[PDB]
Paper text:
The crystal structure of [name] was solved to an initial resolution of 2.29 Å by single wavelength anomalous dispersion (SAD) using the anomalous signal caused by the single iron atom contained within the heme group. The crystal structure contained residues 28–119 of the processed amino acid sequence and a single c-type heme covalently attached to Cys43 and Cys46 via thioether bonds, consistent with the histidine ligands predicted from the sequence alignment. The imidazole side chains of the two histidines coordinating the heme iron are arranged near-parallel relative to one another, at an angle of approximately 35°. One obvious difference is that the axial coordination of the [name] heme is bis-Histidine, while other crystallized cytochromes have Histidine/Methionine coordination. The class 1 cytochromes typically contain a flexible loop that covers the front of the heme, however in [name] this region is restrained by a hydrogen bonding network that causes the formation of a β-loop and prevents the peptide sidechains from interacting with the heme propionate groups. This causes an increase in the overall surface exposure of the [name] heme, giving an overall exposed heme of 152 Å2 compared to 30–61 Å2 for other class 1 cytochromes. To date the heme group of [name] is significantly more exposed to solvent than the heme of any other structurally resolved monoheme cytochrome, suggesting that the properties of the heme are likely to be extremely susceptible to changes within the local environment. Previous studies on the potentials of the heme groups of MtoA indicate that they span a mid-point potential range between +30 and −350 mV, which is lower than the potential of [name] and indicates that electron transfer from MtoA to [name] would be thermodynamically favorable.
In summary, the structure and electrochemical properties of [name] are consistent with its possible role as an electron shuttle between MtoAB on the outer membrane and a range of potential electron acceptors on the inner membrane. Further analysis of the sedimentation data gave a f/fo coefficient of 1.24, indicating that [name] behaved like a monomeric globular protein in solution.
Author numbering: 28 to 119
Amino acid sequence: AVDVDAAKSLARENNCFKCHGVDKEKDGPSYKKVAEKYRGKADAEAKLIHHVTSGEKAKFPDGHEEEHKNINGKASPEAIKNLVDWILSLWS
Ligand code: HEC
C-alpha cells in the first residue's frame, strides 16, 4: 500500500513540486495527467522508475529541453518505488 506522506515528503525534498502539481500543470505535466497517460500500462511502474533515475531529455512548454531531475542514488529504491506508485494512483 502506498505511503502517501512518504511519497509527498520525497517529492518536496527533491523539488518535484516546483514543476509538477497534483492537478495543476506547471513547467511539467500534472501528476493526474501522468497517471491518466499511464493508466493500465503493465510496465508503468518500471517506466516511471526509469524516467526519474535516468536524466533523459525533458521537453518544456516553451520549447527548450533539459535533462530531467535524476534522483538515482539520492533516495532508497523503496522510497522511489513508493513515490512512483503514488503518482500512478492520481487519475482517480
Ligand atoms: C522542472 C525543472 C521539473 C522538475 C524539478 C521535475 N520535473 Fe518531472 N517533468 C518535467 C517536464 C518538463 C516533464 C515533461 C517532459 C516531456 O518531454 O514531456 C516532466 C515529466 C515528468 C513525468 C512524466 C514522464 C512521462 O513518461 O510521461 C513524471 C512522472 C515526472 N516528471 C516526475 C517528476 C518527479 C518525481 C520529480 C522529482 C524527482 C520531477 N519530475 C522533477 C519537469 C520537471
